[PDB]
Write an enzyme that holds these catalytic residues in place. Structure first.
Site, short mmCIF file in Angstrom:
data_model
loop_
_atom_site.label_atom_id
_atom_site.label_comp_id
_atom_site.label_asym_id
_atom_site.label_seq_id
_atom_site.Cartn_x
_atom_site.Cartn_y
_atom_site.Cartn_z
N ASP A 233 59.90 -13.11 78.81
CA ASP A 233 59.30 -12.00 78.39
C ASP A 233 58.43 -11.49 79.68
O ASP A 233 58.09 -10.38 80.03
CB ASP A 233 58.70 -11.76 77.30
N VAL B 173 60.02 -2.84 63.29
CA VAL B 173 58.83 -2.91 63.25
C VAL B 173 57.95 -1.95 63.97
O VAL B 173 57.19 -1.33 63.33
CB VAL B 173 58.45 -4.42 63.32
N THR C 250 63.93 -0.03 70.55
CA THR C 250 64.56 -0.87 70.23
C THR C 250 64.37 -2.18 71.31
O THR C 250 63.30 -2.13 71.73
CB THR C 250 66.19 -0.68 70.32
N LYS D 190 57.95 -8.06 82.21
CA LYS D 190 56.64 -7.27 82.66
C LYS D 190 56.05 -7.38 83.91
O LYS D 190 55.82 -6.11 84.50
CB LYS D 190 55.45 -7.63 81.31
#
Ligand code: NA
Ligand code: NA
EC number: 1.1.1.3
Lengths: 358, 358
Positions: free
Chosen positions: A218, A14, A92, A222
């Site tokens: 996730d 995407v 990716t 970060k």
């Protein structure tokens, strides 16, 4: 232009599709020859490093390829023979590939990417990707945090100018930002956590298995990255408290569907904590926090007064507050932190940055 | 690319002094040599184009220099004999200096500057700079808009990648920002305009004679800049609606004392507009606006919802809202928009972005 850089792309997902689209449409003084395009086992490879004659519907040309993807070690060897500076774009989220970044970098291949893996691994691999060896290629990853928002570039800039980051506090997840913004609101709402999560899923705002967006994993990556840039040697995304919004009883279940189907049975638990905001007129919201002075990093639910900014964000906008020695009143950069277009442009923004530097 | 870049600096005032201290104490891979420094009639210049023999002690040396300041034309000429690529940093606000950027650029001398004159003046002067001559130096002016805030760099990149700006809203004045944050809130007090402006002056938040802030000229210059970057062919900072806050009579006040004490005489108008706003749950904010589709730019007071990010700013932070084709929800960047160190950091950031190229 007299300046030429060869771009090796990986990932036609995407984000990647948006990327290629934006790259192939960018008319620039500098010349960007797309020398490689790989998606899974197929690839379009220009053996002599001249620009691939792909153009419109590269998706098709890729799909019609009889060229098998090269194993990374072979890819590196190939890319080494390039007559012009090489920029590898990794769109990716592969660990395998990330596991190769140092090999790439130490061999003169620069990297531009939204792939958080290599930067959220062990400190050793981190220190290696930024040693600035003469023979090393540049490493940019703006899209890694907040997507296209100028998070990483700004931090790096003010630190070079002599500034010292003191604290970072922010909402780094579009899915979790969307969810709480709808669930926990200024008005005593009544929406069931599981309901906005079901909306988040169907509106595409969430990963296939929403547990993957709900484990906080996730947000921890970060924050590891921003923490390491701010001067806090975070050992990894698991070496500090991170609160998973996943109901223990469902950590078991195999089907994502089963999970979402039973998630509702635990709404009365989360609604409680949102109801216990009342402790001051406060709203809840999933955040990543970093306190440099005491090397304290964490990610989990936090509460702010209805009057605080975080109490009035937009759709999936995910903000970040930067407090530094020079910036007593924090710098607050907010906006979309997800979405193909926005994310891909952050990646192209980094490719231009590298190319102008070569 | 080059490991040595010679820097020529003009202006060692508030931002310049902080610029010079930061540049000279900067830890960096690249070597940044200060070869020329000029203030009023004094100047320091090393004919070797080797580091000026001052260490970090440039202010003392400069204050003692008996060397005269070079006519711009001779400086252009002189810098054309630099053994290494040159970066000129103009820390003045001189329209005179600005008038020479073209020539500097035209002669491969790059520019990093907080000076707005060249970008907020004529429109051809603007198109001049941003032509793609293949030899001319680069031009960077981050500190002209939101001080060190990554406002300009962000626009350029987003545009380069293919995004299109649609609307821009912003509070570009520390003074005016502070004033309205204090005057208009959701608390709806009786605070008088005169009072806050007086305190702003008292606490050193304004120029000596506050008319320089309330005139809204500095904001129009800043809006002109982002208007033009966005794609709106803005002629000048006076070619569009710009609302002054100096009462129609006190613009001919004489003393800068009269003005401040006689200000109160017109509080009634603002305090009623403030009362009208509160009733609608809106707050009054001084802003610069750009609507690209209609090519309409403007500066003045606009009403904002209590829930709007603008109604909760801190201290004197500037803030910009950028709505684009891709970001259907405006990106919002806020933080100090003035201050010596913060503005220096911005200028140095550009110096760094320039040196990396070259
Ligand atoms: Na980013
Ligand atoms: Na700026």
């Amino acid at each position: 232009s007299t300046k030429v850089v060869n771009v090796a792309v990986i990932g036609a997902g995407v984000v990647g599709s948006a990327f290629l689209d934006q790259l192939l449409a960018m008319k620039s003084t500098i010349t960007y020859n797309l020398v490689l395009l790989a998606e899974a086992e197929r690839s379009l490879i220009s053996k002599d490093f001249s620009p691939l004659n792909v153009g419109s519907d590269w998706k098709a040309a890729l799909a019609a390829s009889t060229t098998k993807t090269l194993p990374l070690d072979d890819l590196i060897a190939h890319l080494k023979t390039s007559p012009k500076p090489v920029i590898l774009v990794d769109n990716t989220s592969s660990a395998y590939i990330a596991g190769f970044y140092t090999k790439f970098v130490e061999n003169g291949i620069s990297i531009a990417t939204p792939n958080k893996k290599a930067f959220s691994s062990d400190l050793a691999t981190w220190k290696a990707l930024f040693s600035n060896k003469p023979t090393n290629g540049f490493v940019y990853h703006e899209a890694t945090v907040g997507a296209g928002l100028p998070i990483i570039s700004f931090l790096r800039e003010i630190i070079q100018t002599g500034d010292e980051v003191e604290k970072i506090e922010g909402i780094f997840s579009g899915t979790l930002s969307y969810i709480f913004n709808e669930f926990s609101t200024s008005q005593a709402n009544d929406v069931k956590f599981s309901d906005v999560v079901k909306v988040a899923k169907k509106l595409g705002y969430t990963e296939p298995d929403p547990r993957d967006d709900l484990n906080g994993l996730d947000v921890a990556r970060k924050v590891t990255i921003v923490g390491r840039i701010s001067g806090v040697e975070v050992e990894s995304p698991t070496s500090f408290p991170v609160q998973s919004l996943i109901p223990k009883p469902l950590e078991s279940v195999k089907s994502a569907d089963e999970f979402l189907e039973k998630l509702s049975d635990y709404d009365k638990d989360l609604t409680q904590l949102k109801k216990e905001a009342a402790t001051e007129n406060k709203v809840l919201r999933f955040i990543g926090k970093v306190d440099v002075a005491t090397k304290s990093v964490s990610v989990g639910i936090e509460k702010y007064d209805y009057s605080h900014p975080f109490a009035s964000l937009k759709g999936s906008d995910n903000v970040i507050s930067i407090k530094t020695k020079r910036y007593t009143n924090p710098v607050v950069i907010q906006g979309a932190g997800a979405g193909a277009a926005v994310t891909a442009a952050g990646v192209l923004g980094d490719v231009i940055k590298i190319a102008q530097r070569l």
